[PDB]
Design an enzyme around this catalytic site. Sequence first.
Site, PDB file in Angstrom:
ATOM      1  N   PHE A   1      72.090 -22.901   7.920  1.00 53.38           N
ATOM      2  CA  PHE A   1      71.074 -22.543   6.939  1.00 53.38           C
ATOM      3  C   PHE A   1      71.425 -21.211   6.286  1.00 53.38           C
ATOM      4  CE2 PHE A   1      66.586 -20.882   6.182  1.00 53.38           C
ATOM      5  CZ  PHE A   1      66.289 -21.757   5.150  1.00 53.38           C
TER       6      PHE A   1
ATOM      7  N   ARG B   1      47.641 -16.136  20.971  1.00 54.54           N
ATOM      8  CA  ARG B   1      48.741 -16.926  21.506  1.00 54.54           C
ATOM      9  C   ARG B   1      49.463 -16.143  22.592  1.00 54.54           C
ATOM     10  NH1 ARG B   1      53.065 -16.324  16.427  1.00 54.54           N
ATOM     11  NH2 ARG B   1      53.117 -14.029  16.457  1.00 54.54           N
TER      12      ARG B   1
ATOM     13  N   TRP C   1      59.553 -30.488   7.481  1.00 61.52           N
ATOM     14  CA  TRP C   1      59.978 -29.170   7.023  1.00 61.52           C
ATOM     15  C   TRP C   1      59.546 -28.857   5.596  1.00 61.52           C
ATOM     16  CZ3 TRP C   1      62.008 -26.422  11.002  1.00 61.52           C
ATOM     17  CH2 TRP C   1      62.467 -27.164  12.101  1.00 61.52           C
TER      18      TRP C   1
ATOM     19  N   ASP D   1      70.126 -31.171   8.163  1.00 61.25           N
ATOM     20  CA  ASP D   1      69.575 -31.050   6.816  1.00 61.25           C
ATOM     21  C   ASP D   1      70.553 -30.392   5.848  1.00 61.25           C
ATOM     22  OD1 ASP D   1      67.460 -31.417   4.925  1.00 61.25           O
ATOM     23  OD2 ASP D   1      66.010 -30.963   6.512  1.00 61.25           O
ATOM     24  N   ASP D   2      70.964 -29.165   6.161  1.00 56.36           N
ATOM     25  CA  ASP D   2      71.906 -28.435   5.314  1.00 56.36           C
ATOM     26  C   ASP D   2      73.209 -29.209   5.184  1.00 56.36           C
ATOM     27  OD1 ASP D   2      70.931 -25.713   4.394  1.00 56.36           O
ATOM     28  OD2 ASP D   2      70.417 -25.602   6.525  1.00 56.36           O
TER      29      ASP D   2
ATOM     30  N   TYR E   1      68.771 -29.984  14.748  1.00 52.51           N
ATOM     31  CA  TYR E   1      69.888 -29.327  15.411  1.00 52.51           C
ATOM     32  C   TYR E   1      70.573 -30.135  16.505  1.00 52.51           C
ATOM     33  CZ  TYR E   1      68.283 -25.171  12.948  1.00 52.51           C
ATOM     34  OH  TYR E   1      67.939 -24.254  11.985  1.00 52.51           O
TER      35      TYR E   1
ATOM     36  N   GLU F   1      55.661  -7.150  14.234  1.00 52.76           N
ATOM     37  CA  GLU F   1      56.479  -7.135  15.436  1.00 52.76           C
ATOM     38  C   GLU F   1      57.683  -6.213  15.284  1.00 52.76           C
ATOM     39  OE1 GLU F   1      57.151 -11.307  16.630  1.00 52.76           O
ATOM     40  OE2 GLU F   1      55.107 -11.580  15.892  1.00 52.76           O
TER      41      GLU F   1
ATOM     42  N   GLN G   1      64.210 -14.652  13.347  1.00 56.05           N
ATOM     43  CA  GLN G   1      63.534 -13.464  13.843  1.00 56.05           C
ATOM     44  C   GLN G   1      63.259 -13.377  15.349  1.00 56.05           C
ATOM     45  OE1 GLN G   1      59.909 -12.976  14.695  1.00 56.05           O
ATOM     46  NE2 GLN G   1      60.461 -10.831  15.073  1.00 56.05           N
TER      47      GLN G   1
ATOM     48  N   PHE H   1      56.435 -24.886  11.365  1.00 58.01           N
ATOM     49  CA  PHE H   1      55.854 -25.641  12.470  1.00 58.01           C
ATOM     50  C   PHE H   1      54.489 -26.150  12.037  1.00 58.01           C
ATOM     51  CE2 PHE H   1      58.265 -22.471  15.241  1.00 58.01           C
ATOM     52  CZ  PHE H   1      59.356 -23.319  15.373  1.00 58.01           C
TER      53      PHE H   1
ATOM     54  N   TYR I   1      59.390 -21.027   0.103  1.00 55.95           N
ATOM     55  CA  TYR I   1      60.747 -21.077  -0.433  1.00 55.95           C
ATOM     56  C   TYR I   1      60.735 -20.687  -1.908  1.00 55.95           C
ATOM     57  CZ  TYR I   1      62.533 -23.419   3.787  1.00 55.95           C
ATOM     58  OH  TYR I   1      62.910 -23.717   5.077  1.00 55.95           O
TER      59      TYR I   1
ATOM     60  N   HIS J   1      66.993 -37.353   3.773  1.00 53.22           N
ATOM     61  CA  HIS J   1      68.044 -36.586   3.119  1.00 53.22           C
ATOM     62  C   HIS J   1      69.426 -37.093   3.505  1.00 53.22           C
ATOM     63  CE1 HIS J   1      65.123 -32.916   2.694  1.00 53.22           C
ATOM     64  NE2 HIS J   1      64.849 -33.894   1.850  1.00 53.22           N
TER      65      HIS J   1
ATOM     66  N   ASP K   1      72.712 -27.327  11.088  1.00 57.54           N
ATOM     67  CA  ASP K   1      71.629 -28.299  11.066  1.00 57.54           C
ATOM     68  C   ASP K   1      71.978 -29.485  10.181  1.00 57.54           C
ATOM     69  OD1 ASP K   1      71.117 -26.129   8.942  1.00 57.54           O
ATOM     70  OD2 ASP K   1      69.780 -27.735   8.271  1.00 57.54           O
TER      71      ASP K   1
ATOM     72  N   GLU L   1      47.982  -8.712  15.463  1.00 60.41           N
ATOM     73  CA  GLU L   1      49.257  -8.011  15.406  1.00 60.41           C
ATOM     74  C   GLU L   1      49.324  -7.040  14.232  1.00 60.41           C
ATOM     75  OE1 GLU L   1      52.856 -10.416  16.076  1.00 60.41           O
ATOM     76  OE2 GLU L   1      51.573 -11.907  17.049  1.00 60.41           O
TER      77      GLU L   1
ATOM     78  N   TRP M   1      71.182 -23.297   1.951  1.00 56.28           N
ATOM     79  CA  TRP M   1      70.150 -24.232   1.515  1.00 56.28           C
ATOM     80  C   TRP M   1      69.859 -24.116   0.016  1.00 56.28           C
ATOM     81  CZ3 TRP M   1      68.424 -28.577   3.008  1.00 56.28           C
ATOM     82  CH2 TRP M   1      67.187 -29.074   2.560  1.00 56.28           C
TER      83      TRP M   1
ATOM     84  N   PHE N   1      53.120 -22.456  11.620  1.00 60.23           N
ATOM     85  CA  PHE N   1      54.011 -21.554  10.900  1.00 60.23           C
ATOM     86  C   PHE N   1      54.421 -22.158   9.565  1.00 60.23           C
ATOM     87  CE2 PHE N   1      58.096 -19.196  10.374  1.00 60.23           C
ATOM     88  CZ  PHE N   1      57.572 -17.913  10.483  1.00 60.23           C
TER      89      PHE N   1
ATOM     90  N   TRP O   1      65.788 -23.331  18.325  1.00 56.19           N
ATOM     91  CA  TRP O   1      64.991 -22.154  17.992  1.00 56.19           C
ATOM     92  C   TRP O   1      64.169 -21.618  19.161  1.00 56.19           C
ATOM     93  CZ3 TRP O   1      63.911 -26.974  15.561  1.00 56.19           C
ATOM     94  CH2 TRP O   1      62.784 -27.643  16.077  1.00 56.19           C
TER      95      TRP O   1
ATOM     96  N   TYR P   1      55.887 -34.266   0.070  1.00 55.98           N
ATOM     97  CA  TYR P   1      57.253 -33.860   0.375  1.00 55.98           C
ATOM     98  C   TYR P   1      58.014 -34.996   1.052  1.00 55.98           C
ATOM     99  CZ  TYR P   1      61.148 -31.336   2.532  1.00 55.98           C
ATOM    100  OH  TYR P   1      62.404 -30.940   2.926  1.00 55.98           O
TER     101      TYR P   1
HETATM  102  C1  LIG Z   1      63.921 -27.492   4.470  1.00 59.25           C
HETATM  103  C2  LIG Z   1      64.918 -27.373   5.358  1.00 59.25           C
HETATM  104  C3  LIG Z   1      64.702 -26.935   6.792  1.00 59.25           C
HETATM  105  N1  LIG Z   1      65.988 -26.864   7.562  1.00 59.25           N
HETATM  106  C4  LIG Z   1      65.872 -27.627   8.846  1.00 59.25           C
HETATM  107  C5  LIG Z   1      66.434 -25.429   7.742  1.00 59.25           C
HETATM  108  C6  LIG Z   1      65.504 -24.461   8.553  1.00 59.25           C
HETATM  109  C7  LIG Z   1      65.573 -24.394   9.978  1.00 59.25           C
HETATM  110  C8  LIG Z   1      64.739 -23.502  10.711  1.00 59.25           C
HETATM  111  C9  LIG Z   1      63.819 -22.656  10.042  1.00 59.25           C
HETATM  112  C10 LIG Z   1      62.977 -21.726  10.850  1.00 59.25           C
HETATM  113  C11 LIG Z   1      63.270 -20.335  10.851  1.00 59.25           C
HETATM  114  C12 LIG Z   1      62.488 -19.434  11.627  1.00 59.25           C
HETATM  115  C13 LIG Z   1      61.400 -19.913  12.417  1.00 59.25           C
HETATM  116  C14 LIG Z   1      60.572 -18.940  13.247  1.00 59.25           C
HETATM  117  O1  LIG Z   1      60.195 -17.902  12.721  1.00 59.25           O
HETATM  118  C15 LIG Z   1      60.195 -19.205  14.704  1.00 59.25           C
HETATM  119  C16 LIG Z   1      58.858 -18.958  15.154  1.00 59.25           C
HETATM  120  C17 LIG Z   1      58.500 -19.206  16.514  1.00 59.25           C
HETATM  121  C18 LIG Z   1      59.479 -19.700  17.427  1.00 59.25           C
HETATM  122 BR1  LIG Z   1      59.033 -20.032  19.195  1.00 59.25          BR
HETATM  123  C19 LIG Z   1      60.805 -19.944  16.981  1.00 59.25           C
HETATM  124  C20 LIG Z   1      61.161 -19.697  15.632  1.00 59.25           C
HETATM  125  C21 LIG Z   1      61.107 -21.308  12.413  1.00 59.25           C
HETATM  126  C22 LIG Z   1      61.887 -22.213  11.639  1.00 59.25           C
HETATM  127  C23 LIG Z   1      63.733 -22.706   8.618  1.00 59.25           C
HETATM  128  C24 LIG Z   1      64.572 -23.605   7.878  1.00 59.25           C
END
Ligand SMILES: C=CCN(C)Cc1ccc(-c2ccc(C(=O)c3ccc(Br)cc3)cc2)cc1
Lengths: 619, 619
Positions: A356, A118, A480, A367-368, A411, A36, A253, A592, A600, A442, A365, A84, A303, A596, A160, A486
């Site tokens: 984060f 998608r 997550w 979590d952090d 969030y 992308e 992103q 997700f 880490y 946590h 967030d 893609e 994090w 997704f 997000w 986990y």
């Molecule tokens: C372990 C701790 C986790 N903690 C909650 C922190 C955290 C929060 C959010 C992310 C996160 C980052 C990017 C994306 C996408 O790419 C996305 C793709 C498609 C769409 Br629509 C929106 C975003 C997704 C998630 C990663 C880590």
Amino acid sequence: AYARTLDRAVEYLLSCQKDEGYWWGPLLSNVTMEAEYVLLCHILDRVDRDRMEKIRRYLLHEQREDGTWALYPGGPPDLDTTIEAYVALKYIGMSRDEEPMQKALRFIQSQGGIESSRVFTRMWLALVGEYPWEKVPMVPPEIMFLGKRMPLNIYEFGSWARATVVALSIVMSRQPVFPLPERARVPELYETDVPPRRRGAKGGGGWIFDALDRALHGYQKLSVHPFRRAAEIRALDWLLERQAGDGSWGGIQPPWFYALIALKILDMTQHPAFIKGWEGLELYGVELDYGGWMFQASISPVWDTGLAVLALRAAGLPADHDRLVKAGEWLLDRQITVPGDWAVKRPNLKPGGFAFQFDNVYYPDVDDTAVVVWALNTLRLPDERRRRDAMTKGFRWIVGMQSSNGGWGAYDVDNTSDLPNHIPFCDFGEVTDPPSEDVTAHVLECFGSFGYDDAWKVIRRAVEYLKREQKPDGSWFGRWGVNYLYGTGAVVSALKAVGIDTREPYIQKALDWVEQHQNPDGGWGEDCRSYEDPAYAGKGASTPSQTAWALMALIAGGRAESEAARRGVQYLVETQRPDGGWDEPYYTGTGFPGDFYLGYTMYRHVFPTLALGRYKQAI
Amino acid sequence: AYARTLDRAVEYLLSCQKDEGYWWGPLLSNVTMEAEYVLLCHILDRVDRDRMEKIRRYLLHEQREDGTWALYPGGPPDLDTTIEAYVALKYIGMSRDEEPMQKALRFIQSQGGIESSRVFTRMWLALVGEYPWEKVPMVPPEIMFLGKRMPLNIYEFGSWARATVVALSIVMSRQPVFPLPERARVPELYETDVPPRRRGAKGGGGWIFDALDRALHGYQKLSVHPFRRAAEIRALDWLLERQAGDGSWGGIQPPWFYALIALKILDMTQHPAFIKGWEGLELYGVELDYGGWMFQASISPVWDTGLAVLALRAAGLPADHDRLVKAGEWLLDRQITVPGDWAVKRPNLKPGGFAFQFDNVYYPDVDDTAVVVWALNTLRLPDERRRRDAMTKGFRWIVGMQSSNGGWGAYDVDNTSDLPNHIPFCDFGEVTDPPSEDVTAHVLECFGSFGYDDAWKVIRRAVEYLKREQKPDGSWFGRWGVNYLYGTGAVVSALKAVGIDTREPYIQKALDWVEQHQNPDGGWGEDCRSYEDPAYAGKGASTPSQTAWALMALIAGGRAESEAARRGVQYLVETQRPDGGWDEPYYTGTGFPGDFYLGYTMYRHVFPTLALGRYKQAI
Ligand SMILES: C=CCN(C)Cc1ccc(-c2ccc(C(=O)c3ccc(Br)cc3)cc2)cc1
Ligand SMILES: C=CCN(C)Cc1ccc(-c2ccc(C(=O)c3ccc(Br)cc3)cc2)cc1
Ligand SMILES: CCCCCCCCOCCOCCOCCOCCO
Ligand SMILES: CCCCCCCCOCCOCCOCCOCCO
């Protein structure tokens, strides 16, 4: 025995720490980021030949034998991703003939072609003119008029998704087309007899939305759309106000990219927000030793640092270790002190959470915030004033964030609307941000460090939440993080810290589940397929992290001096590298569920240490 | 004879040209810039000791024997200026005892004290807590609700005032107070028996506004102000959208500063807009060889370059001179191609104008646009495509900007509302941007270069405008230049270029006026007092620029081969320096008649050359 392992693990982590005093491991996802990005550059007409090259080596490098790309390592071929990546390559220079192009192309066709991808994938292609806009789910700028308490107002979506929607509404409002040169046109993505297997809205599509959509595309064709100008500007201003410090948007992103495109549409390429937004990108890029270049879906400095400390501490290092102090001081300068989008639900709540990434104030967030505060609580910084003060702010913020069910989201509070999950546009990943077991866990673990037990109502409301969510086999879902190993680990570890009696039935029913999945090699492992096929629950190649998690669940449940327990420890001790680190060719992070996944980089080093540090504690 | 003068003048200008190919001379104003900067730093809590030092040397340096500061060199002491400079120094470190502080303090007291200063001065003092906010004219955020065609909507004010109003409304909405340390408190500004001589609204105050104001201050005290939050946000967004590229706002000191303060009020110091706005400041600063440091009210790169070319060309250099091409190319990259606030009056007009500074797209001015286009029209650039194209866009833009009376304003069209001139807040400088003679003149001269004569309606409508505006003595007022010499020169020069017959009565009645004011030393001069006292019209010490202007009026009127004509030339030839330049210890530039004056550094070098170049043409 294990001591030598820890000593090596510790000195290793300490060697990875940056000068400023924080840890920051790269985040892994999939080629759609880079793919992308290539398109984005074309759109913004800012293509750097040399960079395209680095991006090409990468793409090919990531391609598998079958000529496809997956969401995670050792995962099934993904159509969207592969499509893609295919388009990206062809644009960069690849000819549809070359082997890689051939194999990928065939996989795509055998799936029904572009019509099976998608919404996003078809949208990106729509932006370059390789797909009709009319067949793309509509999201009107007008959406900016819905009130705080109205069906489908931007505040019903997860943080997000929210930003993305606002940015895109402007884009879809104009439905722009940035033509690709002939050499890159990809009509072959249609050439297929296979029936198009289209994906549907996450929670199912209601004929209402289906119709509503058809309506929107129609209203889109009128010669006049009253108040649309205002609608657009409402979206633009919304973006202009929440642009991150690093020039991003939310530190992720998606919105960032779309926001930049939206600004390009509004001839604002000479406006500060855009400029800063453009150059901000470099910070997320990553030079690969083999010549490639990857773009991070997001960054995890905070994090990483947070867990890094907790690990090194639980390992043995002094609470005032001059090296851990660099971290403490650093973390204190990170705390957010201004209202974020979360304020819409908690106006009388005082800011004190953390983000984060580096600079993202409008989106802290839970979590952090929890991990950071807790981590600090285990340190001795020169200025006990700010340490004392900060923790307090963060603490109170966490509390005021607790949702209705006693659980904690990521969030926002009670962001549990079910309406957005049925929109035609939302056919990828999560769209809402409801409370989860791992986040809640946590949090409890955090309070626990302070002492707050089950006596306090807040704690109980949460514990009840977890109890009600536990799965039939006594396992806990991982939101997550991949996955049941986990979650289960987090919960048990938490419950143990909040005073709960580990002897309890449901607790035991959990530990048993752990021991029951310990692979032969002594460690534990869970493949990302465990989100699609329930047969993979607790199943998969053993990894340093996942082993450490299941190892914590046991140490917390008292079974630290067990067979499976001591066995898992052996694994970590053996599989350890000469430098003190650990390898992990698999993803253990989740973005997700089923859509997704993330890798880490630090996990393989931090958790194994934390787990070993705690094992050394049980003795 | 004069030839040697020219050759030296040319080689000099060429030596001043930067590498990129543009000219850029510093802009001079008064110490209120630096003084307010000091306060701003205090407000934003970003005081740099070393910088304060450089600012102190400057302030003292600029102070006169009597211990005061004026708006222009050799001008009467100014209360406002002196007050702000006094407060500034005392903050930096000066003690109220030291000689300089003593003299200034006495002057301030002998004027009625702080109660006699302009609104701004009292406002700045209000911001630091040295003056009650209640006694400061009120400007509500709600003003953001007035429609495009409503009394006192932000678009009735001039571009330079508009931004300021929007920014300030937010500030006055919160009426913040950033206390000064005890050592800086300035109560002594009240200690005076002299009756406070307060200044009033520019066009006189109507009891209505007087009342309305009192009303606003009252409503300000209520516990609830419905929709004010919205009003504020409306103002913020307005600012966020128009922020200049260099991080400024309009490219002028006032709004920029207030905008930054407003963002500080809204806890947005970590927001991109604020960061970019902060560091952007450095670009306008200037290191003084004697240790001091000054801040420019604005920058004139484009303006300087434009005139620089026209001068060098009219001087002799080839239309394709490789050095003048650097300029041409540069100027072409400057042209604006996006809608500005001017679009509110001309929605179907295509962007094509230019700005005064480097990057300020939302505020192109007719003056620069005209001079730039015209300048280009006298060059031969490698790409005749863009030269041809650019000129056309700019040309058409200028035309579509012509106001009702056939004259041209600076930024907006028919911005002639008389309502804003009566508000209590507006007691300093101009608040509206109506058409002026000098701007209109430059435009006609521009079209003239193309050939367009009196036959074209647009030209006639303008000429009629000028004819009706001419003063009884046949002179023409100078809006953006000091003064009658500046205006008269422009007009005559223009009329001559548009075909008009220089033999005409009113034309002659003008030239006579010129010769009639030629000083003994041969040259011409006009002191800035000519804005306050009509006795100074065409009177004052001779300056290189003002001499060149009156010299052009003559050369244009055919009297080039006259006594006064040849005499004035002698002046320039003699007064020239060995390097080829010229000195000018006086201001010849005008910001706001009688309230704000400017010193255009390049004028003393450019105009003398242009005039001599034209004299050499008459022979
Ligand atoms: C372990 C701790 C986790 N903690 C909650 C922190 C955290 C929060 C959010 C992310 C996160 C980052 C990017 C994306 C996408 O790419 C996305 C793709 C498609 C769409 Br629509 C929106 C975003 C997704 C998630 C990663 C880590
Ligand atoms: C010769 C050509 C002129 N041409 C139209 C260009 C041009 C336009 C505007 C400026 C200007 C800049 C700053 C200020 C103020 O300080 C001011 C002070 C108080 C307030 Br209220 C607002 C601004 C004033 C004017 C200078 C030059
Ligand atoms: C501009 C008015 C300042 C009042 C803002 C406080 C509003 C309460 O927060 C509600 C949620 O909206 C998110 C706001 O933070 C984002 C940045 O907007 C800029 C100023 O707050
Ligand atoms: C959001 C509408 C996009 C259409 C652009 C036309 C804008 C017309 O401007 C009206 C006057 O306001 C002055 C403009 O400068 C502000 C920039 O706004 C950015 C993009 O609209």
